[PDB]
C-alpha cells in the first residue's frame, strides 16, 4: 500500500461514515488492496476479501457486455425494433406509439422517465407489463437521460433472444469464461454466503437496512460480486490476451460511445454500452451506482492501464467520487476535498428540522398546560385528517408516479419522521387552539 | 442561413425572451450570420452588425491572450511569485500568508472566494487594496474554482509588467494587430456609440438595466465588441497563417490545459489560459459569460474549423448554451430541449410568491376591516423594526461577504419585492394582531 493512499481511503471512509469499504487499485500489473471496516455492525463481522457486495448500477456493465456478446454472435442487432423481442411492449410519445430500437435502450436514448425506477423496483408480470403504456419523457434517440430502468428492458431482450433466465445467461457468458468465482445475478430474493449486510444512514449513524431484491430489476442492478472477482473483472477489461475472440471483440465494441445525442455545454460525457466514456486525460472509462443500501463505482484508464474499484457497504455519494479521487491521486498526487454527501446532508437536515418540530410541539404543549392551569376532540383531529392526505399526495404532485414508498426506500430513515412530525405538530397545535377557543 | 438553424436561433431567443440576439457561425471558411431583435426596446433600435455588446466573461480570453503574449516575450513567467508584481498583495490560508504564482491566477487555482466578485464588482484603489488580507477558500494549486475575480489580479499584473493602463495594452496587443475595428476595453465608465442597452429580467419581461462599469473589473469583464469583431476574433484563433510569430506561439500556448488540478468524476473540464478545454468530440474549446445585463458564449472546434459566437443583450442561461446547441446541430443535426433558465425560474418564483404575499396582506387587511366593522403604533411597528434587520443581515449569514447590493444587481429586479413584501406583510399582520388585542 501507499501510506498516503491508505490515508485517503480511511479519510473518505470516516467522512462518509460507511461501516465498511473495499477498494482495489491496479497499476499496469501492480496492484494494491484496501479492505477495511466491518461487513456487519450488528455482529462486528470483520470485512474481508471473501465478502460479497451488491454492485448497484455497475450491473449495467455486465448486462451491456452480455448484449454486446449477443450482438457479436449475430443473435441480436443494434437497429432491431424492440417489438421483435418484446411484442407485449407499448410506449407512447405525445400519445403516439413510438418504435424503439434495442440501441435506444442500450445507450439510454429510450425516453423512459426516471420514475419508472419506482415501479420496476416494486417487488410485485414481465418488464412489458410494468412498462405497458408508459409515457416517454422525450423522443427515442433525441436525448440522453440516465433512466436506470432502461437496462431491465435489455434484460428482457437477453432473456427472450437467448431463451434462458438472466442469471444463467450471466453465468454462462461472463462469470464462467472469465473465471470469476462468486459473481452472480440473483434469481430475485436470495440468500448468499457472507454477504455484507446493507446499511443506510439514519439520524447521523448507519441503520441496518434490507429490502427484497426485485426479480425484474436484477438485469440493471443487484448483481453480487466479491472484490477479487472485480479485480478479475478489471483485469479482463484492461488486457485481453487470453480471452475468446468473440468476447474480445464484444468488449472492444462495448466502449463505442454513442455520439449521436445532443450534449450539454459543460458535460459532453459519452455513454457506451454500460460505461461512461470521457476523453479528457483518458480515456477515463467509468461508471458508478448507488443502491438503497449499497454503492459502488469503478474507473478504468486503459491508456495507462490503471483500474480502480470501490465497493462499499452503504449508500453515500463520497464513495461514488472515491474512484475519481483515487485516480486523481495516481495521476497527480493531489485530491479534492470531500464533496457534500446528499444523503448525509438530507439526514442532518431532517435531524435538525424534526428536532425543531418536536421542540415546537413541547413548547405549545407547555403553553397549553399553562393556560389550563390559569383556567382552573374530533373537531380538532379533523386537521390531522386533512394534513395526512395532503402529505400523502404531495410527492406525487411534485413528480409523476413518485410513491412515498420510493422516498422511504431511497431517502434516509429519518425522512419518515417528517410526515409524523408535521402531523403530530398539527395535532397538538390544532387541539390547543380549539381548547383556547373553548376556554 | 440554414432555415433549421435560424429556427433554432429564433426558438431560443423567444424562450429566453431576450430583446436582441446576435449569432455568427463559421464552418471551415463558410460563414452564417443571425442578427435579430432590437438593441434597445425603449426606442426600437433595430439590432445590427455595428452594435456593440459586452463580452462578459469571454473577456478573460483577451486577458489570457495578453498574459500569454507577455509570457512569450519573456516579460513574465508562469512561476513568478505574485509579490514580484503586486508587492501590496497579501493573501491568507488558515491565517498563514500564501505565495501565489501568476499561473495560479491564470488557471483559477488561486483560492480566492467567489464572493470577492461582489467586492471587485463594487465601483468603489487598486486590486491589492480590494483583495488586501483576503482569506482563501483553498490552498493555491490544490483545486480549481472559477472565482471570476482571479483575472483582475492578472489585469494588475499586465499593467505593472507592461507599464500601461489595461485599455492601452489591449489596443496595442490584440485589437490593432488583429485588425479588430471596434473591440475596446473600457476605461471604466465610458460611453460608446451604438451600444445595445443592457436588459435584465423583471416580473416576466425585460427591464432596462445599467450599472457603473467598475474600472478594476474590466480586465476580467466589460470588454466591448461587435459581432464582426468577434468573427475576426474567431478567424484569428483559427486560421493562424497570417498572424505574427510571437502572437501565433502565444495562442498555441493559450490552449494548454492546466492538468495539475483534481478533477471531479463527471466534469473533467480542463481550463487553459481563458478557455475550457474538452477532448470529447473535439477539442471543444469554449468559454461562456453572463454579466448582470449581458450574456455571451463562444465555442470553437478547431479540428473541424467550426466555431459559434453568441452575443446577447440580456442575461439568461439559455443563451449561455446557445453556442453548444448550435454545435450539437452542426455535429448531429439534433439539439436538446431548452434548459430551465435560472434567472427566468427565479423571476417567476418571485412573481408567484410576492403576489401571494400581497394577496395574504389584502386578506389580513380585509379581516381587520371586518373586525373594525365588527367592533362597532410603535409597539406594533417594532416587529418590522426587527424583520428589517433580520432580512438585511440574512444574505451575509448565508454566505460570507454577500451584500444585498450583489443580490439586487445580479438577481431579477423582482427580488427587491421580497424584502419589502415580507416587511409590509409583517407590518400589517402585527398591527392587526395588536388591534385585535386592544379590541
Numbering used by the authors:
A (entry chain B), B (entry chain A): 39 to 162, 165 to 416, 433 to 495
Sentences from the paper on this structure:
Colibactin, a DNA cross-linking agent produced by gut bacteria, is implicated in colorectal cancer. Its biosynthesis uses a prodrug resistance mechanism: a non-toxic precursor assembled in the cytoplasm is activated after export to the periplasm. Although the transmembrane domain is required for colibactin activation, its role in catalysis is unclear.
Crystal-packing interactions suggest that ClbP forms a dimer, and we confirmed this same dimeric species in solution using single-particle cryogenic electron microscopy (cryo-EM). To directly probe the oligomeric state of detergent-solubilized ClbP, we determined its structure by single-particle cryo-EM. The two-dimensional (2D) class averages derived from this analysis are consistent with the head-to-head dimer observed in the crystal lattice, and none suggests the presence of a monomeric species. After 2D and 3D classification, we selected 109,906 particles and generated a density map with a nominal resolution of 3.73 Å. The resulting dimeric ClbP structure is nearly identical to the crystallographic dimer (RMSD of 0.830 Å over 904 residues), except for a ~5° bend of each TMD toward the dimer axis. We also identified a branched density in the active site of both subunits that likely corresponds to co-purified phospholipids. Overall, our cryo-EM structure confirms that ClbP forms a stable dimer in solution through interactions matching those observed in the crystal lattice. In the dimer, the two periplasmic domains form a canopy over the cell membrane under which the active sites face each other. We discovered that ClbP forms a dimer that may promote the simultaneous activation of the two colibactin warheads, further supporting the proposed pseudodimeric structure of precolibactin.
